[PDB]
Design a protein around this ligand. Structure first.
Ligand SMILES: [Cl-]
Ligand SMILES: [Cl-]
Ligand SMILES: [Cl-]
Ligand SMILES: [Cl-]
Ligand SMILES: [K+]
Ligand SMILES: [Mg+2]
Ligand SMILES: [Mg+2]
Ligand SMILES: [Mg+2]
Ligand SMILES: [Mg+2]
Ligand SMILES: [Mg+2]
Ligand SMILES: [Mg+2]
Ligand SMILES: [Mg+2]
Ligand SMILES: [Mg+2]
Ligand SMILES: [Mg+2]
Ligand SMILES: [Mg+2]
Ligand SMILES: [Mg+2]
Ligand SMILES: [Mg+2]
Ligand SMILES: [Mg+2]
Ligand SMILES: [Mg+2]
Ligand SMILES: [Mg+2]
Ligand SMILES: [Mg+2]
Ligand code: NA
Ligand code: NA
Ligand code: NA
Ligand code: NA
Ligand code: NA
Ligand code: NA
Ligand code: NA
Ligand code: NA
Ligand SMILES: [Sr+2]
Ligand SMILES: [Sr+2]
Ligand SMILES: [Sr+2]
Ligand SMILES: [Sr+2]
Ligand SMILES: [Sr+2]
Ligand SMILES: [Sr+2]
Ligand SMILES: [Sr+2]
Ligand SMILES: [Sr+2]
Ligand SMILES: [Sr+2]
Ligand SMILES: [Sr+2]
Ligand SMILES: [Sr+2]
Ligand SMILES: [Sr+2]
Ligand SMILES: [Sr+2]
Ligand SMILES: [Sr+2]
Lengths: 237, 92, 56, 194
RNA sequence: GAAACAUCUCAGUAUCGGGAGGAACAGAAAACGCAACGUGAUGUCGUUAGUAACCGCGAGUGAACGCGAUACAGCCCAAAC
RNA sequence: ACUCGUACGGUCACUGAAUCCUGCCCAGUGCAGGUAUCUGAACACCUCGUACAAGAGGACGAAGGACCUGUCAACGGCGGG
RNA sequence: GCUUUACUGCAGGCUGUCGCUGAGGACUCUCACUCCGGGAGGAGGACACCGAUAGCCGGGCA
């Protein structure tokens, strides 16, 4: 047959790529030598096209103008501090070691100094729980207990733009506009609505899948469709 | 059918009649050193292996008689043409 | 709209032009490559053995 | 008595033993961070180099080349193929890694001609070979009796034509008798059956 | 082609990548092995021969030593000192 | 490539606004989890064999399978008496 | 052309083993190798990656 849509995806053509040129900034944490003596005033609150959430434009003491992943509550004129001896206030970035337990953090790092990997989407937060000299256990928004290095930096507060999911798109036109700012192909044609040549679920006189939807992890790309390595299906039971 | 374990018959070796013993031919083990075994390892490569890619066939409803006629005195055996028999049992 | 006659009317784009290297109207001005001599692609002249019969 | 060279040779008989084991573990670390083709001022195996034809003279260049270990980096068929020709994983190239090394070196030095090469070890994923190249235009070679043969017009691009020792050995030209029916005088003259 | 077809065959062909010359390549035995008290670098031509050998031992595939010729030509390092 | 992205994400699928609802079935097939025991290749290893080798056998035993469990808004099923 | 529990195979995935590969049947380590860090340095560590091979799955493809 022909390659399925998921195989055309990996080729990285125009249709599948994200509009990178229209993106503002690669929201990463600042680099401090040590000591903490790095701070700055917030100039403006802008819209990040990449995440549909706001981003704070901060100007630092050493002339540096950079955009940062803004938590809730941050405004113009606010002073945010980045470093080891930073204040335990919303918007400040300091390692997990210095941050007290039970305090909601966002833009958490995997490896120290990487820039921030976890808890970056609209209104989410990571929850810091346990402390040690070796391990700082953070509870990620998915409900997972991530055992992390205490030297991993994190910003205090929940990410801004909370409750974005609440309002329905209502009409296809609204989904269109959102999708045009991401790296996705939209609309979605069901495989069951395609021809045999085009998808494993294509064909027949009526629309139904050919074999059971649950596919093995070991399945090759071109066959791995439907419910990938599902531990279960359905709502009941 | 039933068949006697021992009976008198011609020994092509001794050129005279003697009391022969009958035994079902037990299959001998393969060495894996024959020419066919070497051709299997040689001729087999990427893809289909031709003749070596085949599997052993089926069965005939009834197999023939596969016996060994052991002589009582000289101790040498001979082979005879077999006949179709569903089950062959020995008497004593 | 028919793929024939009415689709021919749109055809006012210039692609293949006179080549600086060989003189054939095969230099694709959008691709900057010659479809005849391979100017733009290779330093060596474009030639293939299928341009003539196998025993010739 | 034994030459000092015979000691470098005896050391390389077992590159995983003694002081050389410690030396390779150290060198390969710097080699892995070096390029594909790196010119070295002095040969790692002086005995082998000199035995192969090297001289500490003007226009006698040496260079280390790293080539990947393993079989052919082959693509699968995009068109119809019978079972025999459907392979990818088990297919290997007909030119040994040493010959791939000599060519990469000769291309890096378009003016020089390949004299010979030798192995200088391998790690888990690559092999290293040092190629001795000669300048056929330097009067230091044009006048050298033991090297001036490489200056002749018919010695141009000798590595791409398989005229190297590693080339001739890979072409099946070692044995003068039985077994070399399809190899000598050339593979192309024998219908490509070697 | 095998009156299908998978090994086999078409065929190392078609085609593709790199490159030399006026010719290229090969070449002075870790050869041969008419086993000898024998031959003596290498190509090539005639033959050896559809022979040995291969092969769903099917269809098909297929040399060499030698011999008769052509032409002939033998040398340089590495190391020891 | 997704990705100047990070689960309020984005990938893979099914159904197709709203309203009232969405029963029973895990035997087969699929996917997934587990597993005393059974099955399970090669390397190394042990016995035999061979002055070596081919080869025969053994011990150990991964994923996988057997067996057990979960799962149908998973493929699908919802009869005769 | 398409399909599958047709025949035969080929990619791909999972898994054991060998090489890289090191010090003291469960375990410690640091030096290869890997990742993070501008760097100092941090994490991981003889595993992973990669090369080779073996078993399973494998109309994704021929
Ligand atoms: Cl969305
Ligand atoms: Cl019998
Ligand atoms: Cl060269
Ligand atoms: Cl002779
Ligand atoms: K064929
Ligand atoms: Mg960022
Ligand atoms: Mg939704
Ligand atoms: Mg788009
Ligand atoms: Mg749809
Ligand atoms: Mg349709
Ligand atoms: Mg299909
Ligand atoms: Mg339907
Ligand atoms: Mg349906
Ligand atoms: Mg010739
Ligand atoms: Mg035919
Ligand atoms: Mg036939
Ligand atoms: Mg042939
Ligand atoms: Mg011979
Ligand atoms: Mg519909
Ligand atoms: Mg990196
Ligand atoms: Mg098919
Ligand atoms: Na063979
Ligand atoms: Na060159
Ligand atoms: Na051959
Ligand atoms: Na036919
Ligand atoms: Na046919
Ligand atoms: Na055959
Ligand atoms: Na069931
Ligand atoms: Na029904
Ligand atoms: Sr970075
Ligand atoms: Sr990042
Ligand atoms: Sr279907
Ligand atoms: Sr239920
Ligand atoms: Sr073979
Ligand atoms: Sr095979
Ligand atoms: Sr039968
Ligand atoms: Sr019209
Ligand atoms: Sr136009
Ligand atoms: Sr180009
Ligand atoms: Sr050409
Ligand atoms: Sr040249
Ligand atoms: Sr002579
Ligand atoms: Sr089931």
């Amino acid at each position: 047959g022909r390659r399925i849509q998921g195989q055309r995806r990996g080729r990285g053509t125009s249709t599948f790529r994200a509009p990178s040129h229209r993106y503002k900034a690669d929201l990463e944490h600042r680099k401090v030598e040590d000591g903490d003596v790095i701070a700055g005033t917030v100039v403006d609150i802008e819209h990040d096209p990449a995440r549909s959430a706001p981003v704070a434009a901060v100007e630092f003491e050493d002339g540096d103008r950079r955009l940062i992943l803004a938590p809730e509550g941050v405004g113009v004129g606010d002073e945010l501090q980045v470093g080891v001896s930073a204040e335990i206030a919303p918007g400040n970035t300091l390692p997990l070691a210095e941050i007290p337990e039970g305090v909601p953090v966002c833009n958490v790092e995997s490896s120290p100094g990487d820039g921030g990997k976890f808890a970056r989407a609209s209104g989410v937060n990571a929850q810091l729980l346990t402390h040690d000299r070796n391990v700082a256990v953070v509870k990620l928004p998915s409900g997972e207990m991530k055992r992390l290095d205490p030297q991993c930096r994190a910003t205090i507060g929940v990410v801004a733009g909370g409750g974005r999911t609440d309002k329905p798109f209502v009409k296809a036109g609204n989904k269109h506009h959102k999708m045009k700012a991401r790296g996705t192909k939209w609309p979605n044609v069901r495989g069951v609505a395609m021809n045999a040549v085009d998808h494993p679920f294509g064909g027949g006189g009526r629309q139904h899948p050919g074999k059971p939807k649950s596919i093995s992890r070991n399945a090759p790309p071109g066959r791995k469709v439907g419910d990938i390595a599902s531990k279960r299906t359905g709502r009941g039971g | 059918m039933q068949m006697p374990r021992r009976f008198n018959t011609y020994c092509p070796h001794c050129n005279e009649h003697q009391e022969h013993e009958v035994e079902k031919v037990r299959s001998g083990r393969q060495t894996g050193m024959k020419w066919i075994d070497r051709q299997r390892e040689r001729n087999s490569g990427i893809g289909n292996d031709g003749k070596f890619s085949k599997v052993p066939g089926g069965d005939k409803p009834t197999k023939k008689t596969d016996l060994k006629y052991r002589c009582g005195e000289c101790g040498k055996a001979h082979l005879r043409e077999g006949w179709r028999a569903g089950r062959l049992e020995f008497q004593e | 709209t028919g793929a024939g006659t009415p689709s021919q009317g749109k055809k006012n784009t210039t692609t293949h032009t006179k080549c600086r290297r060989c003189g054939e109207k095969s230099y694709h001005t959008k691709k900057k490559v010659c479809s005849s001599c391979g100017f733009g692609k290779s330093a060596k002249r474009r030639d293939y053995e299928w341009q003539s019969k196998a025993g010739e | 008595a034994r030459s000092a060279y015979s000691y470098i040779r005896d050391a390389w008989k077992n590159p995983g033993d003694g002081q050389l084991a410690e030396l390779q573990w150290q060198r390969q670390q710097e080699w892995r961070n070096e390029g594909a083709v790196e010119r070295i001022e002095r040969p790692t195996r002086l005995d082998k180099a000199r035995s192969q034809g090297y001289k500490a003279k003007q226009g006698v260049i040496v260079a280390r080349v790293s080539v990947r270990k393993g079989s052919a980096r082959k693509r699968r068929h995009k068109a119809g193929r019978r079972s025999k020709r459907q392979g990818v994983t088990r297919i290997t190239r007909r030119k040994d890694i040493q010959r791939v090394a000599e060519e990469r070196a000769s291309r890096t030095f378009p003016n020089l001609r390949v004299l010979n090469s030798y192995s200088v070890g391998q790690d888990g994923r690559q092999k290293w070979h040092e190629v001795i190249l000669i300048d056929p235009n330097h009067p230091a070679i044009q006048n050298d009796d033991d090297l001036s043969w490489i200056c002749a017009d018919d010695q141009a691009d000798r590595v791409f034509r398989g005229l190297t020792g590693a080339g001739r050995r890979n072409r099946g030209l070692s044995g003068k008798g039985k077994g070399s029916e399809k190899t000598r005088p050339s593979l192309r003259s024998n219908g490509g059956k070697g």
